[PDB]
DNA sequence: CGGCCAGTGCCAG
DNA sequence: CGCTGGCACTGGCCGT
């Protein structure tokens, strides 16, 4: 459920995805990003529908978070039609996050 | 004798006012103060102890006192000043002779806690002065309200100068009379405080001697200053800066950016059981943030723009961009393509310089492209550092002379070589090296206009043949007969060894040399011929056979210095040198080289000492407003302006006609000689 | 930020 | 065990 995302596949994945789309800038090598992993993976399940959960890996796609001027991770993004909606940086739990997204949704 | 010191508006290139001078006289055994009234009365004393042929004590005077007063008689009594060199002793020129072991602040240019070893009390004390009265000054003021200004504690006269300047010679008297109590220096039957002129220096070691000849020429060639091209270096800049804009905006496109973790403060610890993870970057707990804002009684709470959440937890990152002159940024990006470092430092950190740069090997044939780029980089930065952003840099010293007036330790190396500084006109780039005509030829005496007619100077370079090989080919005569210091003047020393050695360039066979004669191991030989260590072991026994005197000469000095030894108990730590002083060995395998290094650089300073003194007498002056002027000298070269072809042909014959005086003043077991090169700049004369 | 200060490398002789 | 030197850069660390 959960969409990979690439430095080359995000503009058509996630600007023009119209729709709710929650991207998540991480790195393999953060405590609080391998925290909330597993967190994402049932978000995507349940908020299915209505909320699509990407997962952009900083150090394999380095072109992205810097036009988002990224200075912590984890850091969430919930995109709307091309544009930051709402920003959240930090290993929130199950239910801040879902607190979170009904907030924005 | 008289010891002195004044306290001046400024350093010598700008001081228009002498504040005040205190003068110690060895006869009545009493201080004197001047105030800036009494300047001629000041300049009247000196001149009296001239007069009756006595001695003046100075501490720096040769480059600071003597000069700046010569300078402040013209300007504010309209008078000519000119001490004698033969009636001048400097404390600082003694201390640098005697305790040549040790570091000094240069009078406080140099940090003291930057330097290694110890320093000598009295030399200390004297160089920390100026920063010592600065402290009081701006203290006074805090202490007043009043604020304190640039450097204001200089610009006018007030009795804590004074003091200053009272105290500076009581301290110089001790430190005189601390290093005439040297007994290998200074002979004990004689009281050197109570002697005229000629005595104090037929009587004591010759080096005292040649140290102060050495130290008042060269404060002249520092007052002379090298004429520098200003515009073809800051062309030369503008070249060597879009290049590196080019190379940075490739090598960006190659090795994109990335995050690092910065400014984590807490520690991260497992969630689960809750065990510190040193290992993992540190982390940032925020205390504020929610997801709304405090309150709303059912009625939704106003969300929290807030980025953050108190509880949970993030990594704080910068973004890092590539940078070829980080050496750790190189060494991320090789490894990431694939690079195995090999050889690492003694820090764990892998080595990254030219030698495995030009090794290393990726896949990627972009990559595997830019290294080379990297190299370039490099490269470049060493000579735009050195040239137009470095601290040292040779455009923030151009004078408004046209002139970088490089600084000279006559005797700031242990071997008795001088050192050079702000900037190092000794490390110039070669003029073989990459950018190294531009560099060269921008330091040229045809920078020089002459004050009346106009025309360009030219340049005399004067640089001493194979110097430590011939000094090698004395010492080891005593074990071959002179048959090596035959054999050297067969045509080009270095030129031959390149031929046999098989070597590219004349350059490389002098680096071979001089690396196998001072202990270079069978490795280190094969770099310097860019081979293996197995072509190491070939050159060096291939040479120790050719003269196995060489053998001879390294047993004899390690028996005369060592009796055991990691760690060594010494016999005697010192090599006597050719005018007599001690020098230090620091260690039992650098010895040949402390006993080869010292004698050409006595024979160097006695050298450029001779040669100026030899123009002298034939009638040449010695200044822009004259025939010729020294512009620098680096250990076995001196570089000369003439205001002639002409003069230049004199100076270059007169050159070696003072080194052949040299040889023959120390009966050298080897002739010496000298290479002479006429023209326009440095580029063309060496 | 700018002095300090180790690490590293390279320039010259 | 090349040795003698100066000095530029990066990157860690600390106080106006
Ligand atoms: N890599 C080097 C080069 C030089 N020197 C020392 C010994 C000689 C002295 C002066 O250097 P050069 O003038 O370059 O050497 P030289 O033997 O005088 O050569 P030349 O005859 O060409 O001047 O510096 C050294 O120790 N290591
Ligand atoms: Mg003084
Ligand atoms: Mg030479
Ligand atoms: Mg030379």
């Known amino acids: ?105 | 004798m008289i010891v002195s010191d004044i306290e001046a508006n400024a350093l010598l290139e700008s001081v228009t006012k002498f504040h005040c001078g205190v003068i110690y006289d060895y006869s009545t055994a009493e201080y004197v103060s001047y105030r800036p009234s009494d300047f001629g009365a000041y300049l009247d004393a000196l001149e009296a102890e001239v007069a009756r042929g006595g001695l003046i004590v100075f501490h720096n005077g040769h480059k600071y006192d003597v000069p700046a007063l010569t300078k402040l008689a013209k300007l504010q009594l309209n008078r000519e000043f000119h001490l004698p060199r033969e009636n001048c002793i400097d404390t600082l020129v003694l201390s640098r002779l005697i305790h040549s072991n040790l570091k000094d602040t240069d009078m406080g240019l140099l940090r003291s806690g930057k330097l290694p070893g110890a320093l000598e009390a009295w030399g200390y004390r004297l160089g920390e002065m100026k920063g010592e009265y600065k402290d009081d000054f701006k203290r006074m003021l805090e202490e007043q309200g009043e604020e304190y200004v640039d450097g204001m504690e200089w610009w006018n006269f007030n009795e804590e100068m004074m003091d200053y300047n009272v105290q500076d010679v009581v301290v110089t008297k001790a430190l005189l009379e601390k290093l005439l109590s040297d007994k290998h220096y200074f002979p004990p039957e004689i009281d050197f405080t109570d002697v005229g002129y000629t005595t104090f220096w037929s009587e004591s070691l010759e080096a005292v001697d040649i140290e102060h000849r050495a130290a008042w020429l060269l404060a002249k060639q520092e007052r002379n200053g090298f004429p520098f091209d200003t515009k073809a270096i800051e062309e030369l800049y503008v070249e060597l800066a879009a290049r590196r804009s080019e190379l940075l905006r490739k090598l960006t496109e190659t090795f994109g950016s990335w995050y690092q973790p910065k400014g984590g403060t807490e520690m991260f610890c497992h969630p689960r059981t809750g065990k510190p993870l040193p290992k993992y970057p540190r982390i940032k707990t925020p205390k504020v943030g929610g997801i709304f804002k405090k309150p709303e009684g059912r009625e939704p709470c106003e969300l929290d723009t807030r980025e953050y959440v108190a509880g949970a937890p993030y990594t704080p990152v910068e973004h890092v961009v590539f940078n070829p002159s980080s050496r750790d940024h190189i060494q991320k990006k090789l490894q990431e393509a694939g690079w195995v470092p090999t050889k690492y430092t003694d820090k764990g950190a892998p080595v990254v310089d030219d030698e495995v740069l030009e090794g290393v090997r990726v896949d990627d044939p972009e990559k595997q492209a830019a290294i080379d780029l990297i190299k370039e980089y490099l490269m470049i930065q060493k000579r735009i550092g050195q040239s137009a952003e470095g601290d040292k840099a040779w455009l923030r010293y151009v004078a408004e002379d046209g002139k970088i007036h490089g600084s000279v330790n006559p005797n700031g190396a242990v071997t008795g070589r001088a050192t050079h500084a702000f900037p190092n006109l000794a490390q110039i780039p070669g003029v073989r090296s990459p950018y190294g005509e531009q560099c060269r030829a921008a330091f040229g005496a045809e920078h020089h206009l002459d004050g009346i007619t106009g025309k360009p100077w030219v340049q005399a370079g004067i640089d001493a043949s194979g110097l430590e090989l011939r000094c090698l080919a004395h010492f080891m005569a005593r074990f071959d007969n002179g048959e090596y210091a035959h054999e050297i003047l067969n045509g080009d020393i270095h030129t031959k060894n390149q031929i046999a050695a098989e070597l590219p360039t004349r350059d490389n066979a002098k680096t071979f040399i001089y690396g196998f004669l001072y202990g270079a191991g069978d490795e280190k030989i094969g770099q310097i011929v860019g081979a293996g260590k197995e072509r190491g072991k070939e050159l060096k026994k291939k040479f120790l056979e050719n003269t196995p005197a060489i053998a001879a000469l390294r047993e004899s000095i390690q028996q005369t210095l060592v009796e055991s030894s990691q760690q060594v108990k010494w016999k005697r730590r010192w090599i006597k040198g050719l005018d007599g002083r001690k020098v230090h060995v620091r260690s039992p395998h650098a010895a040949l080289n402390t006993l080869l290094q010292s004698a050409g650089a006595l024979i160097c300073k006695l050298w450029i000492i001779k040669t100026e003194e030899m123009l002298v007498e034939k009638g040449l002056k010695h200044g822009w407003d004259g025939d010729f002027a020294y512009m620098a000298w680096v250990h076995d070269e001196i570089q000369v302006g003439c205001r002639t072809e002409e003069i230049a042909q004199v100076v270059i014959e007169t050159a070696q006609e003072a080194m052949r005086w040299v040889g023959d003043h120390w009966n050298f077991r080897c002739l010496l000689d000298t290479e002479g090169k006429m023209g326009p700049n440095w580029a063309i004369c060496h």
């Open chain 1, 1 to 105: 459920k959960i969409i990979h995302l690439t430095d080359d596949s995000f503009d058509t994945d996630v600007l023009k995805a119209d729709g709710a789309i929650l991207v998540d800038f991480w790195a393999e090598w953060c405590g609080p990003c391998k925290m909330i992993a597993p967190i994402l993976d049932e978000i995507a399940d349940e908020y299915q529908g209505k909320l699509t959960v990407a997962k952009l890996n900083i150090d394999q796609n380095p072109g992205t978070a810097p036009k988002y001027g990224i200075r912590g991770i984890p850091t969430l993004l919930l995109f709307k039609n091309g544009e930051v909606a709402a920003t959240k940086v930090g290993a929130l739990s199950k239910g801040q996050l879902k607190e979170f997204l009904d907030a924005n949704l």
